[PDB]
C-alpha cells in the first residue's frame, strides 16, 4: 500500500522547512554510523539529530526489528536517504547556483568509492545514495543500473536487487523492462561503465607483486 | 515576520497530516471537531501554552496556539497544524472521500454537520462541494471545493458586513500552481461564471418553520 | 574535404583561447545570424570581426560569389567559429560544476530558447542547438544530430540539410555512429528532446481567449 511518491511529499511536509545542504552533508557522511547506533540501540523508535535536525526514525536495524511491519509514512533510515537524495536533486534541477553550492559541501561516499564525483552529473552522483531507487524517474534509472554493475564487476547478491526491480516507474507502466523502453535504461548502463571503479595504486614494488 | 507565505504550500502539509492522523480518522471525529471548533478556539485563547494538544472524539492532536493574544502575530512552522488548517485539512479529507466512491458520502450525511454552513440553511442536498466549502480554512484548497471558499468570503463581504481585510488571505492562493488567479483566466473560470449559488442560497438563518405569529418579517 | 574538425578547434584555441571568456562568448551568440549580413555585404575574402574585445578574422563565404571558393582548414568560418565556441563553453563547464552556473547567466542561445530547451534540460542539449555543434557530437552527446532530425520530423525541413550532419565520425569506425551502442546513445538523445515540447516561447502568460494558444 506504501506510496513512495507520497512519503517524500509527506517527508518534505514535516522536515522540509529545516533542510539545507549542511545537514545533508552530515547525514550522508554519517549514515553508516547511524546504521550502527540503530543496530545497537533497542528502541523501535529513535530520535536522530543530523546537524540541528532532528529526525524521528523507525529502528529496523536492531536484530529483532529486521522484519517488522513498517508503517507507510514512517521515515526509516533508508527511506530518509532516498528523500534526502530526491531533495538535493530538486534543488539542482531548479536553480543552477544551488547545484554548484551543493557540489562544494555534500559528498556521496558510495559514489567516491567506485569513483563517480559530481563531474559526471548529479543524477548519477546522487544516485549512489541508498533509497534513490524509490525515485527511478527522478534519477534517470541510475539506481537500477548502479546495482546491476555491482552485480557484474563486483558480485553482490542477485537477491539484493529484487527490491529495486519492483520500484515502478511513472504512471501506467509497472517499470519491468519493455514497459518503459529499455533504451533509456540501456543508456544509463553504458554511462556508468564509462567511470569504472578500482582502488590502487600508482607505484610498482620491485620487491614483488 | 511579515509577508507573505514563504512556505507553504498546504497540499504537502495536508498529505503529511494524513500521515500523522489519517490511520485513525473517521467521520465521527469530524462531527465532534467541526462542532467543537468554536469552543476549542476559546480554550486555546484561555490556556498559556504555545502549542497544545486536544482530543476530539478520540484523537489526539497537537495543535498550534493562534488565538491566545500573545501568540497571534508569532510565526508558525509548516508541519505545525493550526486549528484553522486543521479545519481546512479535515474539510478536504471529507471532500476527497466523497469524491472517491459515493458510499462514504452517506456516512458524512448522517454524521458530519457544518455550523457555519447551517446558519445559511445549506445541507448535503447542495452537493458536498458547496457545503464543505463553508468550513474555515477551506480556501487553502480552492479546487477541492470548486472556488466556493473564495466566493463565500466574497459573498458575505457584500451581502453582509465584512472587510476586504479577509480577502488578502483568500487571494495569494494558488489554483494548482496558477499564474493569473486574481479573477483572471479564460471563460471567467468558475469563480462567478459557474456558482451563482451563494447568490441563490438565501440569507436564511430563519431558525424555525412558521412560526407565522406576531412578528414583522419574516 | 581534408580537415578533421578536432584539428581546427585546437588551432582556434591557440589564437584566441588565451583571451576567450564567457563574456566574449555572449556577444557572438547574440550577433550570430546578424553577422551573416556584415560578410555578405562587404566584398572582402576575410574580415576582422569584433565580439566584445576579441577580435577574430572571419573568412568569407557568405558572399554570393564566394560559394565557388573552397575553404582552407586552418581558416575559420562563422559556422566553424560558432561550433568551436559551442565546444569551448561545454568543454569548460565539463570541468568543475562551479563554472557551469557562470554560463547559465552570461550566455544565451537563440536557437534552443525558441524550440523550448533552456539550460534546465542540460547544457549538452542547450549548447547543442548551435551551428557547427555537429562537428562535435562526441562532446554534445549526439544532440546536434538529434535536433536536426527533429526539425525535419515533426515540423518540416529538407532532409538534404541532414546530409551534412550524417558525415561526422563519432571517433573512428567510424562515420557511424549508426549502431554500436546501441545504436549510439541516439534515441535516448532523440526522444529526450521529444520530452520537451515544441511550445514556441516569447509572450507573457497570458489567457486567450478569442483565438490562438
From Swiss-Prot, chain B:
InterPro entries reported in the protein's UniProt record: Bunya_nucleocap (IPR001784), Bunya_nucleocap_C (IPR043011), Bunya_nucleocap_N (IPR043012)
Molecular function terms from GO: RNA binding
GO cellular component, one term: viral nucleocapsid
UniProt keyword list: Ribonucleoprotein, RNA-binding, Viral nucleoprotein, Virion
Binding site for RNA: 2, 5-6, 38, 41, 67, 85, 156, 168-169, 172, 174
Main location: virion
Subcellular location: Virion
Origin: domain of life: Viruses
Entry comment, domain topic: The N-terminus and C-terminus are involved in homooligomerization and play an essential role in viral RNA synthesis.
Assembly and oligomerization: Homotetramer. Binds the viral genomic RNA.
Protein family according to the UniProt entry: Belongs to the orthobunyavirus nucleocapsid protein family.
Function according to Swiss-Prot or TrEMBL: Encapsidates the genome, protecting it from nucleases. The encapsidated genomic RNA is termed the nucleocapsid (NC) and serves as template for transcription and replication. The NC have a helical organization.
Protein name: Nucleoprotein
